[PDB]
């Protein structure tokens, strides 16, 4: 169980971003997920396909082995809210929902999204949590402004007014977490159930 | 595509505001809430035996159909 948490910080996706097309990457990229058996080490979720790296201690330089793990696109976006939904990465949206931890939201968001492309019999009742959810948003909204449950705008305003330390980013987070986009992981959701 | 030109001061703007709660020393969301759906997910998640997270949502979410219902 590693831990999750909301990052917002300037040139972090950046550095990943690039790493990701680098060819060296792609050499110990297929290490850590024959390690970690293709399993996201944040929420559970075993996939072959999208699944993505990222660096524990979220330093994208720092690229050996045990600072590596796998992580989903619903977590691995959670390391780089400025930049959910900027440029076709992700998508998703803040929520206030203290009543689940970020990686539990992600587990269960997988079996939403599951059970609502491939109807078995749930989808209604997996389409009513997630709007639920995503209901949580206007808590936020009303805390911090119009438009600020938009996980790019959030993270610019904390980027841009300089926003340093862990213990203040702890607590602006407090409670509120990126749900993710079923619309714009629509790609990734039908792909993930036919392989 | 562009965006709207107000945008480098709605950025300044909003920007502002943040900044005062910044300053105000209340940076968090501290709201009591109730919703039947998120509760009821939640009681299932929590009360769950079920030790693989994605299998424990798999049984969590039948049983939130199974009590809605
Ligand atoms: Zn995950």
Same mark, same amino acid.
């Given at each position: ?5 909301? +990052? ?12 990701? +097309?680098?060819?060296? /990457?792609?050499?110990? #990229?297929?290490? &850590? !997920? $024959?390690?970690?058996? =293709?399993?996201?080490? /944040?929420?559970? !979720? ?26 989903? @696109? !619903? @977590?691995? $976006?959670?390391?780089?809210? #400025? ?5 076709? =990465?992700? %998508? ?23 059970? &609502?492309?491939?109807?078995?019999? =749930? ?5 009513? &949590?997630?709007?639920?959810?995503? /209901?949580?948003? $206007?808590?936020? #909204?009303?805390? !911090? %402004? ?6 790019? &705008?959030?993270?610019?305003?904390? +980027? ?24 714009? /992981?629509?790609? $990734?959701? #039908? ?5 | ?69």
């Amino acid at each position: 169980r590693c831990e999750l948490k909301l +990052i917002a910080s300037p040139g972090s996706w950046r550095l990943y971003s690039a790493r990701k +097309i680098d060819a060296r /990457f792609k050499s110990y #990229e297929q290490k &850590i !997920f $024959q390690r970690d058996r =293709y399993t996201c080490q /944040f929420c559970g !979720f075993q996939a072959a396909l999208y699944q993505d790296i990222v660096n524990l201690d979220g330093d994208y330089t720092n690229n050996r082995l045990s600072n590596l793990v796998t992580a989903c @696109c !619903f @977590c691995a $976006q959670c390391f780089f809210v #400025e930049s959910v939904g900027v440029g076709g =990465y992700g %998508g998703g949206t803040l929520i206030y929902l203290p009543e689940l931890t970020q990686a539990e939201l992600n587990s269960l968001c997988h079996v939403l999204f599951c059970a &609502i492309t491939n109807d078995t019999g =749930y989808k209604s009742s997996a389409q009513n &949590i997630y709007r639920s959810f995503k /209901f949580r948003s $206007q808590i936020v #909204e009303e805390k !911090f %402004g119009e438009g600020t449950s938009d996980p790019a &705008i959030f993270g610019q305003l904390m +980027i841009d007014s300089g926003v340093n330390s862990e213990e203040i980013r702890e607590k602006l987070f407090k409670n509120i977490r990126l749900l993710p986009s079923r619309a714009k /992981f629509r790609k $990734q959701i #039908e792909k993930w159930a036919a392989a | 595509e562009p965006p709207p030109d107000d945008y480098l001061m709605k950025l300044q703007k909003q920007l502002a505001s943040f900044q005062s709660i910044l300053e105000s020393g209340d940076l968090s969301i501290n709201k009591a809430v109730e919703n039947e759906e998120i509760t009821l997910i939640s009681k299932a998640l929590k009360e769950s035996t079920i030790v693989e997270p994605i299998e424990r949502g798999v049984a969590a979410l039948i049983a939130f159909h199974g009590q809605n219902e």
